[PDB]
């Protein structure tokens, strides 16, 4: 997260870290046994780390649970990033508490201009790299479809939306992929891609979760 | 020049 702020320990209790001997992507807990992340975050050997603040120190309230299923959307296109969504089933259910909690799925899509919370352990610099120990947070608005498409001609599918700031300086970044965009208490976005980070006229692009609520429910119900 | 926001990034020539 570039241009954000320190969230505060466990203030984003649905935020998880995907770990393969290092943090590589975020995700969102949507019930005690299932996590939403990005399809491009798929790999073997994922350990889901819940209740985290400082990801480099065992502080208390962590739960480390192996992924037992990592389900990429069958129509994920790795070149366009269309359908960039993945469901992870935890090997055992997380223990839900004030510091480890699920986030609601949307019942309808969000509107341009609505303020959302984006969070993660990604790079905090728009030039070079600096990776934080503790979770970072950013308030950012959903942009209009025409502005999103104007920023990224020929690249925005109906399963994507833009959020952030065209003046630069505030954005998600490498390491935030798969993590949450939460608007009005609903998971509306998944950190996906962008041109650089926090660059002028290049907002973040996010998977449009409201288009996948039925697929998520049907996939969980059959697994 | 566009990249996924994973570690490591997956990037396009553009
Ligand atoms: Ca920790």
Residue numbers in the entry:
A (entry chain A): 16 to 34, 37 to 67, 69 to 125, 127 to 130, 132 to 183, 184A, 184 to 187, 188A, ...
B (entry chain I): 1 to 14
The authors write:
SFTI-1 is a cyclic, 14 amino acid peptide (GRCTKSIPPICFPD) stabilised by a dense intramolecular hydrogen bond network and a bisecting disulfide bond. It is also one of the smallest natural inhibitors to conform to the Laskowski mechanism and is a potent inhibitor of trypsin (Ki = 0.1 nM). Kazal domains are “standard mechanism” (Laskowski) inhibitors which mimic ideal protease substrates, presenting an exposed loop (known as the canonical loop) to a target protease. Consequently, an equilibrium between cleavage and religation of the scissile bond occurs, resulting in the formation of a stable inhibitor/protease complex.
